Amino acid sequence: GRVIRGQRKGAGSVFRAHVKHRKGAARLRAVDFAERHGYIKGIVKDIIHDPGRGAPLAKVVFRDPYRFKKRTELFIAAEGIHTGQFVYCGKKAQLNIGNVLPVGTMPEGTIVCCLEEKPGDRGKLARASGNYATVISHNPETKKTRVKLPSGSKKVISSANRAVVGVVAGGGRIDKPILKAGRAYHKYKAKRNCWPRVRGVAMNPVEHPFGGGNHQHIGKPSTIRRDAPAGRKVGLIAARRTGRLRGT
RNA sequence: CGAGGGCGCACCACCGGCCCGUCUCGCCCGCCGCGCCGGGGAGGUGGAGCACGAGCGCACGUGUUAGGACCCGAAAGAUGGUGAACUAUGCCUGGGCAGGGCGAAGCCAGAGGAAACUCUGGUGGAGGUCCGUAGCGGUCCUGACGUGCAAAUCGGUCGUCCGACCUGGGUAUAGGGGCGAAAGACUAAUCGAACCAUCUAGUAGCUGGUUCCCUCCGAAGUUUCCCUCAGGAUAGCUGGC
RNA sequence: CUCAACCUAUUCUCAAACUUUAAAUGGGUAAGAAGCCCGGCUCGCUGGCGUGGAGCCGGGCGUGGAAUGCGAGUGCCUAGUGGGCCACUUUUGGUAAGCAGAACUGGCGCUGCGGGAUGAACCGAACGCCGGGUUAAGGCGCCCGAUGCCGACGCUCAUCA
RNA sequence: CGCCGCAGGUGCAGAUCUUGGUGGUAGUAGCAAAUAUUCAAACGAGAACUUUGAAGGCCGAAGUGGAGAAGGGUUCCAUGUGAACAGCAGUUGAACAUGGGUCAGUCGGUCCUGAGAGAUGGGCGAGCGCCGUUCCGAAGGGACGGGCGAUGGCCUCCGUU
RNA sequence: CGGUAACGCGACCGAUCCCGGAGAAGCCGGCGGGAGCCCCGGGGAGAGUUCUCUUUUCUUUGUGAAGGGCAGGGCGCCCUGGAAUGGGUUCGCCCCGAGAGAGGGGCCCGUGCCUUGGAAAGCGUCGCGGUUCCGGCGGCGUCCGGUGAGCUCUCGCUGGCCCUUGAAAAUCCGGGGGAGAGGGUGUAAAUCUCGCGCCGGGCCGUACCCAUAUCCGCAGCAGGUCUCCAAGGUGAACAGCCUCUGGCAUGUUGGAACAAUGUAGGUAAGGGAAGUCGGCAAGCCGGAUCCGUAACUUCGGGAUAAGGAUUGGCUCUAAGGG
RNA sequence: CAGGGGAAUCCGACUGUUUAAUUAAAACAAAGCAUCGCGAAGGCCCGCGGCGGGUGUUGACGCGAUGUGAUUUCUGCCCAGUGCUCUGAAUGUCAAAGUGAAGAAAUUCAAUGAAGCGCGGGUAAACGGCGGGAGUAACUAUGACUCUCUUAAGGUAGCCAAAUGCCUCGUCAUCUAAUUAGUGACGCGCAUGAAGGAUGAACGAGAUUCCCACUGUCCCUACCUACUAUCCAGCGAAACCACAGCCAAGGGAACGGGCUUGGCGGAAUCAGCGGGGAAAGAAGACCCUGUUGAGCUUGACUCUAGUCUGGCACGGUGAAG
RNA sequence: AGUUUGACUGGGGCGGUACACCUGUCAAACGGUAACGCAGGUGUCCUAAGGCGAGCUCAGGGAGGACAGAAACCUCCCGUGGAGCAGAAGGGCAAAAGCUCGCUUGAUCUUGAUUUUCAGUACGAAUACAGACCGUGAAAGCGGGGCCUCACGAUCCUUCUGACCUUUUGGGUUUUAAGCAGGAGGUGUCAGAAAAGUUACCACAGGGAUAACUGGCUUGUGGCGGCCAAGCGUUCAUAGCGACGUCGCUUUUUGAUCCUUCGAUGUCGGCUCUUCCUAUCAUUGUGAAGCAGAAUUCACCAAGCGUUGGAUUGUUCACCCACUAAUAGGGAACGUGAGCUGGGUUUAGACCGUCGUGAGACAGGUUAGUUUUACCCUACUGAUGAUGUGUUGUUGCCAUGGUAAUCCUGCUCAGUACGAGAGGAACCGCAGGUUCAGACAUUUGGUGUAUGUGCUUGGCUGAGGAGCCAAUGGGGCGAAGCU
Numbered sequence A: 001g002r003v004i005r006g007q008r009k010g011a012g013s014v015f016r017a018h019v020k021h022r023k024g025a026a027r028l029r030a031v032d033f034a035e036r037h038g039y040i041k042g043i044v045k046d047i048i049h050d051p052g053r054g055a056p057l058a059k060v061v062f063r064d065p066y067r068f069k070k071r072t073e074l075f076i077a078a079e080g081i082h083t084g085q086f087v088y089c090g091k092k093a094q095l096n097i098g099n100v101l102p103v104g105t106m107p108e109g110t111i112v113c114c115l116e117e118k119p120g121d122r123g124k125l126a127r128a129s130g131n132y133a134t135v136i137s138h139n140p141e142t143k144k145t146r147v148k149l150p151s152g153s154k155k156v157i158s159s160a161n162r163a164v165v166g167v168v169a170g171g172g173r174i175d176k177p178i179l180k181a182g183r184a185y186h187k188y189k190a191k192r193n194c195w196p197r198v199r200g201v202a203m204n205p206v207e208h209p210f211g212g213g214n215h216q217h218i219g220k221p222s223t224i225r226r227d228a229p230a231g232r233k234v235g236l237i238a239a240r241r242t243g244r245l246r247g248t
Numbered sequence B: 001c002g003a004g005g006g007c008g009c010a011c012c013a014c015c016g017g018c019c020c021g022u023c024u025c026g027c028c029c030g031c032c033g034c035g036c037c038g039g040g041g042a043g044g045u046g047g048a049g050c051a052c053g054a055g056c057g058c059a060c061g062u063g064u065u066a067g068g069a070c071c072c073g074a075a076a077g078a079u080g081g082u083g084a085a086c087u088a089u090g091c092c093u094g095g096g097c098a099g100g101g102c103g104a105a106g107c108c109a110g111a112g113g114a115a116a117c118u119c120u121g122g123u124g125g126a127g128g129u130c131c132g133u134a135g136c137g138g139u140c141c142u143g144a145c146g147u148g149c150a151a152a153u154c155g156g157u158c159g160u161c162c163g164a165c166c167u168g169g170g171u172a173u174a175g176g177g178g179c180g181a182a183a184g185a186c187u188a189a190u191c192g193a194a195c196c197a198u199c200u201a202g203u204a205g206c207u208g209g210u211u212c213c214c215u216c217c218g219a220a221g222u223u224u225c226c227c228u229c230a231g232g233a234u235a236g237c238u239g240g241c
Numbered sequence C: 001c002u003c004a005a006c007c008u009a010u011u012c013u014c015a016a017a018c019u020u021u022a023a024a025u026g027g028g029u030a031a032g033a034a035g036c037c038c039g040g041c042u043c044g045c046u047g048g049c050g051u052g053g054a055g056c057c058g059g060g061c062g063u064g065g066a067a068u069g070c071g072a073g074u075g076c077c078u079a080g081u082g083g084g085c086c087a088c089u090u091u092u093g094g095u096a097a098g099c100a101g102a103a104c105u106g107g108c109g110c111u112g113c114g115g116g117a118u119g120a121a122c123c124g125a126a127c128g129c130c131g132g133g134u135u136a137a138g139g140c141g142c143c144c145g146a147u148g149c150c151g152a153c154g155c156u157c158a159u160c161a
Numbered sequence D: 001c002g003c004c005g006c007a008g009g010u011g012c013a014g015a016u017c018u019u020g021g022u023g024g025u026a027g028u029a030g031c032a033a034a035u036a037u038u039c040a041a042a043c044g045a046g047a048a049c050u051u052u053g054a055a056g057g058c059c060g061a062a063g064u065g066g067a068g069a070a071g072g073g074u075u076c077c078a079u080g081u082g083a084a085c086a087g088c089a090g091u092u093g094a095a096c097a098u099g100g101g102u103c104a105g106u107c108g109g110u111c112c113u114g115a116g117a118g119a120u121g122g123g124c125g126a127g128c129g130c131c132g133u134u135c136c137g138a139a140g141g142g143a144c145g146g147g148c149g150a151u152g153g154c155c156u157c158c159g160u161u
Numbered sequence E: 001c002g003g004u005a006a007c008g009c010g011a012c013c014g015a016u017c018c019c020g021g022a023g024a025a026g027c028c029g030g031c032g033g034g035a036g037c038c039c040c041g042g043g044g045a046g047a048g049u050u051c052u053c054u055u056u057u058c059u060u061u062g063u064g065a066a067g068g069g070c071a072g073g074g075c076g077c078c079c080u081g082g083a084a085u086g087g088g089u090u091c092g093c094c095c096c097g098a099g100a101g102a103g104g105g106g107c108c109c110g111u112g113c114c115u116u117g118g119a120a121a122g123c124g125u126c127g128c129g130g131u132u133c134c135g136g137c138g139g140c141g142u143c144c145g146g147u148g149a150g151c152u153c154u155c156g157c158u159g160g161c162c163c164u165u166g167a168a169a170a171u172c173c174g175g176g177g178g179a180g181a182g183g184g185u186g187u188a189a190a191u192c193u194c195g196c197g198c199c200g201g202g203c204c205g206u207a208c209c210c211a212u213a214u215c216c217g218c219a220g221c222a223g224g225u226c227u228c229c230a231a232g233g234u235g236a237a238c239a240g241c242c243u244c245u246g247g248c249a250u251g252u253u254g255g256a257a258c259a260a261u262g263u264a265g266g267u268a269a270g271g272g273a274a275g276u277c278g279g280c281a282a283g284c285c286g287g288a289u290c291c292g293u294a295a296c297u298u299c300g301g302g303a304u305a306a307g308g309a310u311u312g313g314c315u316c317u318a319a320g321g322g
Numbered sequence F: 001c002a003g004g005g006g007a008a009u010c011c012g013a014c015u016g017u018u019u020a021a022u023u024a025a026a027a028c029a030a031a032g033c034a035u036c037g038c039g040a041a042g043g044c045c046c047g048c049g050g051c052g053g054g055u056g057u058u059g060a061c062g063c064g065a066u067g068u069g070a071u072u073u074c075u076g077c078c079c080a081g082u083g084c085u086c087u088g089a090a091u092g093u094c095a096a097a098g099u100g101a102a103g104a105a106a107u108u109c110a111a112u113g114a115a116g117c118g119c120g121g122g123u124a125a126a127c128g129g130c131g132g133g134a135g136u137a138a139c140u141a142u143g144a145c146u147c148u149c150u151u152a153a154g155g156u157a158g159c160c161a162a163a164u165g166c167c168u169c170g171u172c173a174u175c176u177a178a179u180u181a182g183u184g185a186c187g188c189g190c191a192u193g194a195a196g197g198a199u200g201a202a203c204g205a206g207a208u209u210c211c212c213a214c215u216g217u218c219c220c221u222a223c224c225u226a227c228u229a230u231c232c233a234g235c236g237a238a239a240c241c242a243c244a245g246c247c248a249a250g251g252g253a254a255c256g257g258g259c260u261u262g263g264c265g266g267a268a269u270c271a272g273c274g275g276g277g278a279a280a281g282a283a284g285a286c287c288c289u290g291u292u293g294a295g296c297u298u299g300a301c302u303c304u305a306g307u308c309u310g311g312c313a314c315g316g317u318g319a320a321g
Numbered sequence G: 001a002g003u004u005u006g007a008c009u010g011g012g013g014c015g016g017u018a019c020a021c022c023u024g025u026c027a028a029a030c031g032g033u034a035a036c037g038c039a040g041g042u043g044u045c046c047u048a049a050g051g052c053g054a055g056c057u058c059a060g061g062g063a064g065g066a067c068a069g070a071a072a073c074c075u076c077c078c079g080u081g082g083a084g085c086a087g088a089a090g091g092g093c094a095a096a097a098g099c100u101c102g103c104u105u106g107a108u109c110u111u112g113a114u115u116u117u118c119a120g121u122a123c124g125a126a127u128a129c130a131g132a133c134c135g136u137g138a139a140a141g142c143g144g145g146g147c148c149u150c151a152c153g154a155u156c157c158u159u160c161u162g163a164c165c166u167u168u169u170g171g172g173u174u175u176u177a178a179g180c181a182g183g184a185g186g187u188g189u190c191a192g193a194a195a196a197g198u199u200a201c202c203a204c205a206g207g208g209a210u211a212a213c214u215g216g217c218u219u220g221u222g223g224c225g226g227c228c229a230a231g232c233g234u235u236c237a238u239a240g241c242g243a244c245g246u247c248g249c250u251u252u253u254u255g256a257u258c259c260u261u262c263g264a265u266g267u268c269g270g271c272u273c274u275u276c277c278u279a280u281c282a283u284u285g286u287g288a289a290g291c292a293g294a295a296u297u298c299a300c301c302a303a304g305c306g307u308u309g310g311a312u313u314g315u316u317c318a319c320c321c322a323c324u325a326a327u328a329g330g331g332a333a334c335g336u337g338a339g340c341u342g343g344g345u346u347u348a349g350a351c352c353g354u355c356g357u358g359a360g361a362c363a364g365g366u367u368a369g370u371u372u373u374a375c376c377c378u379a380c381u382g383a384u385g386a387u388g389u390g391u392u393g394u395u396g397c398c399a400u401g402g403u404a405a406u407c408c409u410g411c412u413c414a415g416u417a418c419g420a421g422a423g424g425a426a427c428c429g430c431a432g433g434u435u436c437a438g439a440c441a442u443u444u445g446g447u448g449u450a451u452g453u454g455c456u457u458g459g460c461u462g463a464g465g466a467g468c469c470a471a472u473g474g475g476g477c478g479a480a481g482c483u
């Protein structure tokens, strides 16, 4: 009869992201005439640590083509780029690590970092550290490009979508065991209130579907339908299968 | 006074009769409408009826009922508000944590060895490291106290004491909601649904109470029915006129 | 020769759910005037028949047709109650129960009083306030009213009467 | 107030009844956590407790020391009083009464933003309103620069407009 | 305007605009500098002891801000030059043909010292007058040194840790650029972040308590309630114990007794858990030095395993430095 | 000022956290392991409402939802059941709307056929389940071996009278003089067992057994100290109270202070004490009843937010079928 | 989200249905009559098993007949029903009510009355008529279901049937709808709601109308006795026993019941402490033996005195070790929680096994879990006092109440009596111990703040000397007193 945890997360109050010390939204520069037709040269000024994010951010400085002014972007750092390096964004940009150019102008098999989901928005795909997408095929008739997302799923996008070349820095961060409840505490204190996690079987029936019983047992199948109401769908949601993955 | 006789009030029993409904049987009558028209009879039976009215208004008493309903009494339910000064958790900005032990990586030197490499002594000062202050906690005495110092405190003994550490202030989350390293915990001494006012004199087959005198009469705990078995209706028993 | 079963005549012992017979106590009805006896009339019922039956109309009969006691009949409104319990006797379950369950009458509940020392129910008796007399049940060594009778006849000795 | 009528918020021993008052308990339990007081004198009606002096002790700098924040709100400081209060007392008091006391360019607030809160535009909403905080706004009311001039005047030339 | 340079000098024209800096950054370690305090040796002034001894013991023995100068600390700043037989160097590190060692410079901080302030004040003593209660008047003094793993602040250097990287904005400044402005050689002009001079700074708060009696807990309630300063001895020590400065009167009463039963604290012959549900409670052990340490193990631990010896006072000796 | 120590068993890895006011634990958390959803027109969630809002200043090395719980080593069989999920294969059923027919219309009938349910696959680190019957070896006894049934499979590796074993204080060994205790072992195990089983250092105010040392826990009590209690001056409550207050027996609502019969009974008090007053504290919380509730659950009844699906409208322009 | 989750009931739950009915009995000779009284039955079945009429006689047995037998069919005789009538039981029934045939649909349409339960309400069932229309029989008649006693169902709603019926709202026609009358669809909790759990996180109103603990009745069961004497006892009923039976007592067992207590009587065990009982384990005095002695057994008077230390377990019980004269059994609100303790049971946390879909449950295991108040009355323990002898004191008496001692060992008797032997006593006496009691401190021990006297750590008074503080600084020895 009580609103469960997970239901309370959508209200926001105590579960909002900790964004006090975040350095800004990491994103490409807006597509403009210079990037749509030629290229524009920027210079990497610093590579910084964004709290709550494993990928380093790159602070790149461009020239505004219409006003005497300097523009500072907050690219996602592709691995290998350094300060004092020139990166080039545009259609005519060359195929080098850190450059930003449309997918339609890249050979099949190119590894990319900050890929646009829609032509014009800034980078949306393969942004987490060590991840990358791959260009698979081109359809110049429909102005389409087929790519392979980090999850393995294939996706057809417009050829005007831009991406950074290379993998995103931050390497194999998940390889190191955390080893300590304290290090998990510091990891999630920079992200949001999602830790520690109390098992539902350890709760009372009032605050969880799995709660209650004289033994800590689920009592009902933990696989739950997709259209189950909020407050009921806990456990394995819409699970196509369960159990140890044998076969692939 | 009076055997006998007569008219007989009210009322009671019975038998007839009349009105409406409904059956059964049957033959007649009426005429501006000749009809799938209208009326009538006899014999049963259904009616809270007729059969020379008794009602209306007012007052009083008793009984039953709806209302706060003889008085006091729930656990609850609903509507609208007030609280995070305590606590729970997130964030912001500050403050704080003796003295010792162990001795991680890194580094220096020496030695052994044919090499490969190993050994030894220093240095270094890591760690949700150990002993142990302050702080934070609260194990046991099942100690004190138990109309207390105290609506949870005190003594000794204890756990931890560089971290998932302690803490001020500022903020955010509000009641079927919040928040929970999860005990149904905490949410102003209140929590298995806070507090405040109202609906509300909530309902109670249940408990308690129910205020002057004398006189007269005087019970029942049984029948039948009831989601009836601590209650009613019903007959009985009672009193009054 | 012997033992079974069978039959016949006997013999022992029984029955809430067996019975020929069959009480006591018990239940119903009658013990007149709305009765009896005479005549007649009505009927579509019945029918050999003036036959039956019923109803109706007149008339005559009072020794008022057992005992005993009592004044009856009738209507309206109506409260409380709807937990009962006990005793003699009958009686079911139970080893039994101050158990549980029935029948009959009485009681307590609702009830005081005399007696049972004491006691809701036993025994006597029911109640206005009193005087006198007499009792019931029960008593009469002393408590404590009354045997302080020259009471009658026996029985009994208990170191748990 | 009696009598004849009329009308009631009309009669109390109870309700762990309501309000008020009062007993026994009972001059009882008690005034026992953190070592501790003593001598002399003064004032005074009155001294275990006030004041002064002399001793003996305690806190032992993580104080029983010296200062602040929050909170209190005059408790601060003098003088006086001895009703009540300070669970004994008091000549004392944070009590009572009468007066007095808080002085800033440079100590803070004020200013800035933080987590956040919150109008407008817009949207929603029966509605009080609430959602949202850059989102769906014609969102800059400013400026030495230049020009047209009013020459407003110490109209030279520089301020104004 | 000067210097090869780092950069310096008292100013050092300049808008819109652009770039940058400061504000503006965690925790922990180890070193170093400065101060305050503590300590030691003398010189004064005043006190204490003097039964005996003690040239003794105690107290006290200043220099604000803001300037100027000078030490001291730091520099990932410059010039010369070119280094292996590598050298320099730290407690640790670390550094160098991308320029070591050496020599010479420059800059930053300068809270330390001197000086203006400044002795005239303050303080300590010793006196003399009074304004019933004079910032009175006066004398004398306010001195010289030494030490440190010392404590506390502060400044600096250099490391470590992080799947943790530790605000923002007001506000202030520097630079880039050169739109412009200023005078015709003067009596100079525009301009000036240089020196001195003139005027002003409104509003609100401000006492006191800050807790075993000024706050919350119904109270003068053994509870709760955020901080700053921090002496001597012992000692590893902000431990416990004793003391100085400062504070207090024993925690809302006293007096007399010393029964039981309590509450708190001790001791107990011989035995040693036989007590009890149960070694509950109490007791044993304990610091430091020198030895000596097992099984097992995730090789880190176990581990202060277990077990043993020693420990005072006094008189010396030896080693460890500038 | 200032650790008693040692040998083991159970549980939890450790550090951390927890029921403020009876439970600090073995409970929670944890790192590690595993599973699930999701490529943004999205997953999960809030919201009365807005193309509103949180995750999200995010993007699969991420976010969301679960389970187990460090290391080591393993994690067996079962997809019948209930879940979940995948494709609709001629398809069964299936509402509104739409279509056709009859009728004078209301209406009636028929055809058509969305999700869903059925049907068919997958899935147990989803919920869960893992049994009997027979026959069968040359002492007996068991059954290596062979058939079955319910039916989806019959409990594998391990571990055990375990915090899980009724019988049970199981049986054997060991520890003791003596042991329902402990440890080791056995195992047809009422009713052990594999994301949890079995181990294994370090750790623990966790549960247990033993040994050394140590002692007033005890034999068996004594003495001492401080504060009380005590007495006094001053000050001064509360709880509770039908009336009260000596007993034995009787009867009685079956345990009397009162009543009957007996024993008896002598002011006013002080310090103690805990036998009685079925002492006080609270309209028993156990148990039952009530056509009295509330918290929670679901295969109860009746609904509902949200979601999936069909239809109508916004809703338009062209062609191929 | 809202609500529900029956009742009865020797508490409730589980189980049953005694919840609507029928038969016999209970039931006490009218009728009626109860319990979770006894023995049973019912929710159907039948176009015939209904209705007439006719004709027959059934069960069983005896005797016969080819196969044919103990049972096949045929025949005769006996046959009061001993068969059958659908079913449970009871009644009833013989040219019946049974069996077999023939014809049939009275199992139809109607109005009232009555009986049964009963309130004299309903339903159901039944009885007697009356009016139709039929069946059957020659007819009298019989028949509107079953030989009788059971076999079943309101309002509202639905559905069907009937009246050339009524209404369908200003009139008319026609669909439709409503109505009147009679059937059916059903409520089995059967006079008739539409209904799953859990709560140890729990709540309220109450209940001693009702359980768990004491007490009370009872005493089946437990325990302890007696009577008879078949037998056991080499023989011998009775030294010691006691089968088959039978009579009792007890209330330390467990039941049975539910009278008191639910505005509360604190619920196990242990510890502590007192008293009581006797059904006597030991001790004193005795009697009997299959008592030679020693030992043992049975019984009597008898409760004065004693009845112990430990391992395991919460235990009560149990069991073992060891001592002993013996290690008897019990009561006192299963004595004793303002006496304690809190191990157990019995709240809330948690784990495991089993059960359940789940919440959750488990006379299953395990771990952690607040034990409050006396100052009142009495009782008791002690302490002053009080009444009466004129006051006051000394010395006394004893009414009454209490009461206290207990058991064992060794030596001697005595290697004696007795006995074949092995063994093996007793009385008198002596020396001592156990348990208990009342004292006491010469001695030994304990205490020790005489704060007595040394020693000693840290600090403090300038040092010496003398001291002090550290909640008794520590420690050695220690008078007196207490013990």
Ligand SMILES: [Mg+2]
Residues within 6 Å of the ligand: A197, A198, A199
């Ligand atoms: Mg978890």
Ligand SMILES: [Mg+2]
Residues within 6 Å of the ligand: A202, A203, A204
């Ligand atoms: Mg839980």
Ligand SMILES: [Mg+2]
Residues within 6 Å of the ligand: A001, A205, A206, A208, A209
């Ligand atoms: Mg739920």
Ligand SMILES: [Mg+2]
Residues within 6 Å of the ligand: A201, A209, A210, A211, A212, A213, A216, A217, A218, A219
């Ligand atoms: Mg569960």
Ligand SMILES: [Mg+2]
Residues within 6 Å of the ligand: none
């Ligand atoms: Mg008539």
Ligand SMILES: [Mg+2]
Residues within 6 Å of the ligand: B063, B064
């Ligand atoms: Mg009436």
Ligand SMILES: [Mg+2]
Residues within 6 Å of the ligand: B068, B201
């Ligand atoms: Mg009322």
Ligand SMILES: [Mg+2]
Residues within 6 Å of the ligand: B077
């Ligand atoms: Mg409701």
Ligand SMILES: [Mg+2]
Residues within 6 Å of the ligand: none
């Ligand atoms: Mg707060």
Ligand SMILES: [Mg+2]
Residues within 6 Å of the ligand: B129
């Ligand atoms: Mg640590």
Ligand SMILES: [Mg+2]
Residues within 6 Å of the ligand: B130
């Ligand atoms: Mg520690």
Ligand SMILES: [Mg+2]
Residues within 6 Å of the ligand: B142
């Ligand atoms: Mg306690």
Ligand SMILES: [Mg+2]
Residues within 6 Å of the ligand: none
């Ligand atoms: Mg719970």
Ligand SMILES: [Mg+2]
Residues within 6 Å of the ligand: none
């Ligand atoms: Mg009310």
Ligand SMILES: [Mg+2]
Residues within 6 Å of the ligand: none
């Ligand atoms: Mg009642």
Ligand SMILES: [Mg+2]
Residues within 6 Å of the ligand: none
């Ligand atoms: Mg009876």
